[PDB]
Design a protein around this ligand. Structure first.
Ligand code: SF4
Ligand code: SF4
Ligand code: SF4
Ligand code: SF4
Lengths: 449, 438
């Protein structure tokens, strides 16, 4: 008879001994955030469909408008009608409501405040003094259980803890000056160093973003995207599940930071800022790095968003996991073959960055991310084809052979041996799927050992 | 177990289920126990008279110092007591002054024009482009799909009944900063006029006469946590769901606006959620005063969005709640303040806090509020003990569905949890396909 899936059992089977899995060498240096394809001058500008050179997201807007008017849900993809085309883009746009300039990357601005003191919630609760009372709990075992419980309440589908590896913290952040209003923000972005100093609390000066030396840990959250919607990549509904999850990330960071502060510790939110989420997720045991460059998780594959919070709260680090992703990516290459921009390498892992957008000195598959970004204005979205076609994104990967869990190789055979339907089909709260939602149930035993 | 078949079976013909008489008038929001001068001030445990929530704060502090999770409920240790209150305080992060009631302030903006998201997306012009869809059937499917993405566990549609819209809102002057908001609350008429868009003047909150519909969302609370009522973990699931309400309202208003229509958010403001929920078919009114749903009983929060978007109203539902509450009276016997009546339904309010003129069980809500400073939380014992709150009250006799008439905090922290406090044992009940959306 079929053994009922046990996600906790699976994670237990593939747990590693302690130690950062990421292999590095001496050319490794912290990475300036302005180097990402979204922000770097070499990659920021892209032509629209008329050949006008614009900020990438503005060229993409032009393509969204053109598709709506032509009754399309994506590049060369006709919608049922213009109404459906419009609806897909209205959903996507609305998804982004609690996110600033596509990622919330500016530290200590807007939603990403490094202190809770000015927040309306903190002000309301000030007479209780939770943010000023010394911690009543210092035991990292109890704290790990409390904070992971809180993280699930705050919308995380996965949560893990790691010691903070400063190699993955950006050397300089992209931000704006404190006196710049939102409407001028995209015009006034600057760089600001992130430094570690012997200070009691996270603080920002005119010159630096200062993280205390006592900032020991990072809490990493996985925010699951919707499979049916992502499978429409590169079309509009894949853009919508992406967008909604960014707003979920933001609410997670704020909720969790407030809990940690009210427990008597400090907490730094980040969403897409501060440091490299994939590396933190790997070290916290959410999953493994992959050819496409994302963290692949046992539960969702790469079809999951990441955010993280940094804290001095004593915690128990989780163990990394090795469930064989590296070995499958070595032989699969489906993402590389399907990628519309040929951004993803079919070659071996190296320590040498492909371009300025990669951080050299760590062993990974080196992808050309200027090529990736270049496809976004052409398609009018955020693509995601690589996530959509990855076999680990399918719900059906895990089987039990009577002794242990293993990955079903039939899912990796190549060749294997619409959007109206998504709007008319299965949905549930936050786009979560009740057929698989049991996989992320949590009891104390799986929160702390 | 099949929730879609259950709702289908108990569907009623069209028409508001709420019985009213000629005495019924719209209710001034200031009259609620939270805000009215007769009920607002309560003593703390030292005998000092303060705003009710400040006195309740004093009890939270006392409990933490004394290692308690609630009134006369010892925690495992002071650390656990602290953790429950930290979780509760954190839950409220996206909520203003306990309920987001001030209309067109903070998160509850009646236009999307100044929002950072609207500004970022302005070159696409979705909020300026006339609607491409006017068909109420397709719009109902689209907006309900969006509602589920936005965090609703239940969603329904009703024509807007203006009887449940507050005659006058509690709000603050528009240029008063948050830090002065509690001390500068005022009362402001909500009026319906022939105008193109929702608008606020110095004198009035103006809703257009074209505002035909209300979309009501149910946001499920956590059963294990609510069952700790009146202790701190019940406060925590309450708090987190208020921030979920807020995000729902903003997400869905933005979707509706980007579809070419206008949308008014509300959370606990603007009007009476229970009446809207009943008219939208989410559930039935109960003895305790809450909307009881087939899926969650009363253990579910409500919010609503008002719009001119053409929509298909849902049918009201009758699964026998009224007859059950007739003989049950469990909430009423367990209520720590004896706020809930054991008597029959009437059209006459017990005090200023009730809206007279509608047939309901009339409860004393000043008595309810009085228990919150004494216990240091938001109680919820009535929700906790209600048989409809229990996991599976639904059975099937081989032809149809029917109600089964037969029917610590450390362990909660150490026990089952899942994303947003939802339960995979029951999460299938709220799965949705087009056929159940419209
Ligand atoms: S598609 Fe194949 S090669 Fe690419 S990330 Fe997924 S498993 Fe790895
Ligand atoms: S998002 Fe699209 S263009 Fe970018 S790497 Fe993935 S498949 Fe290629
Ligand atoms: S406890 Fe009993 S009387 Fe009270 S609301 Fe529930 S079913 Fe009705
Ligand atoms: S919340 Fe508590 S005091 Fe208020 S009515 Fe319910 S049981 Fe009674």
């Amino acid at each position: 008879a079929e053994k009922e899936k046990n996600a906790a059992e699976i994670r237990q089977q593939f747990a590693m001994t302690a130690g950062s899995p990421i292999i590095v060498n001496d050319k490794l240096e912290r990475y300036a955030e302005v180097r990402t394809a979204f922000t770097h001058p070499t990659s920021f500008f892209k032509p629209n469909y008329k050949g006008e050179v614009k900020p990438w997201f503005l060229s993409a807007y032009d393509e969204k408008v053109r598709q709506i008017e032509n009754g399309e849900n994506g590049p060369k993809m006709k919608a049922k009608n213009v109404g459906e085309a419009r609806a897909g883009r209205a959903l996507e746009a609305a998804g982004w409501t609690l996110d600033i300039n596509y990622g919330n990357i500016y530290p200590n601005r807007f939603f990403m405040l490094w202190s809770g003191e000015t927040m309306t919630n903190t002000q309301l609760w000030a007479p209780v003094g939770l943010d000023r009372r010394p911690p009543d709990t210092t035991d990292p075992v109890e704290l790990t259980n409390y904070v992971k419980f809180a993280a699930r309440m705050a919308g995380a589908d996965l949560v893990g803890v790691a010691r903070l590896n400063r190699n993955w913290v950006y050397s300089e952040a992209v931000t704006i000056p404190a006196d710049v209003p939102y409407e001028q923000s995209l015009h006034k972005e600057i760089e600001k160093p992130i430094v570690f100093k012997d200070v009691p609390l996270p603080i920002e000066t005119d010159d630096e973003l200062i993280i205390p030396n006592t900032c020991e840990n990072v809490i990493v959250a996985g925010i699951a995207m919707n499979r049916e919607m992502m499978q429409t990549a590169p079309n509009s509904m894949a853009c919508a599940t992406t967008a909604f999850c960014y707003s979920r990330m933001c609410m997670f960071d704020m909720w969790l930071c407030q809990f940690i502060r009210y427990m008597g510790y400090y907490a730094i939110p980040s969403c897409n800022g501060v440091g490299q989420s994939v590396a933190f997720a790997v070290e916290a045991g959410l999953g493994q790095a992959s050819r496409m460059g994302a963290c692949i998780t046992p539960e969702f594959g790469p079809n999951v968003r990441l955010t993280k919070v940094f804290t001095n709260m004593p915690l128990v680090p989780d163990k990394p996991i090795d469930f064989g992703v590296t070995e499958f990516c070595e032989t699969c290459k489906k993402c590389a073959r399907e990628c519309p921009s040929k951004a993803i390498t079919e070659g071996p892992r190296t320590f040498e960055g492909r371009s300025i957008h990669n951080q050299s000195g760590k062993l990974q598959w080196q992808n050309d991310y200027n090529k990736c970004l270049g496809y976004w204005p052409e398609s009018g979205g955020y693509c995601g084809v690589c996530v959509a076609v990855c076999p680990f994104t399918k719900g059906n990967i895990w089987i039990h052979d009577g002794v242990e869990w293993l990955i079903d190789n039939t899912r990796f055979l190549d060749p294997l041996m619409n959007i109206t339907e998504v709007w008319d089909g299965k949905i549930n709260t936050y786009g979560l799927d009740a057929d698989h939602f049991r996989d992320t149930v949590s009891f104390r035993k799986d929160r702390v050992k």
